[PDB]
Design a protein around this ligand. Structure first.
Ligand code: K
Ligand code: K
Ligand code: K
Ligand code: K
Length: 206
């Protein structure tokens, strides 16, 4: 499966792609404003994520830091990113279909559209100004809008028991972005696509 990753932001981002225990494709690349990067993701990939990182510095070797979504200081992510991170999430070729969503469960850093480039399902989008409207207690000094689990580390925000309800904080995310997961047990906003669909992730789509 191909994913075209497109940075429409006025600022540089460092795209990242991982399934948590490994890179997808090269795992990360710089995208200047306007640039497109196409990756190939193995069929059957389960629990993959794509995200943007902001304000990154890398050396020679591909090692450094980012202020949002840093993945163990690698340019080329092999692991998931440090919140806050708006997340494009996908599982491919799961009993005949693909499943995509956007999640704010790990907070929000960059607005995003995640859409098929092939037939037979809708895209999803979270492109509201969550960072600008972020509740004060969730603002990350580093940049972005943290989720409540990240900030407060409670069973209720993190849904540790698998028992949790929506919260004042999750409802903020949901209000701004109805079509993205706002907490672990949110009413799913997952879209079913044909197996082996292809996709475009667009940062700052509007
Ligand atoms: K169709
Ligand atoms: K869309
Ligand atoms: K709400
Ligand atoms: K779910």
């Amino acid at each position: 499966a191909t994913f075209e990753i497109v940075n429409r932001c006025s600022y540089t981002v460092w795209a990242a792609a991982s399934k948590g225990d490994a890179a997808l494709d090269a795992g990360g690349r710089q995208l200047n404003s306007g640039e497109s990067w196409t990756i190939n993701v193995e069929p059957g990939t389960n629990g993959g994520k794509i995200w943007a990182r902001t304000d990154c510095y890398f050396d020679d070797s591909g090692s450094g830091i980012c202020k949002t979504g840093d993945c163990g200081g690698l340019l080329r992510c092999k692991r998931f990113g440090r919140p806050p991170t708006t997340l494009a999430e996908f599982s491919l070729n799961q009993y005949g279909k693909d499943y995509i969503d956007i999640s704010n469960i790990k907070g929000f850093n960059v607005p995003m559209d995640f859409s098929p480039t092939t037939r037979g399902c809708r895209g999803v989008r979270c492109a509201a100004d969550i960072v600008g409207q972020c509740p004060a207690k969730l603002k990350a000094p580093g940049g972005g809008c943290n989720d409540a689990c990240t900030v407060f580390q409670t069973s209720e925000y993190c849904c540790t028991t698998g028992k949790c309800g929506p919260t004042e904080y999750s409802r903020f995310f949901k209000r701004l972005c109805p079509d993205a997961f706002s907490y672990v047990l949110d009413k799913p906003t997952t879209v079913t696509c044909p197996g082996s669909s292809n996709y475009r992730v667009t940062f700052c789509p509007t």
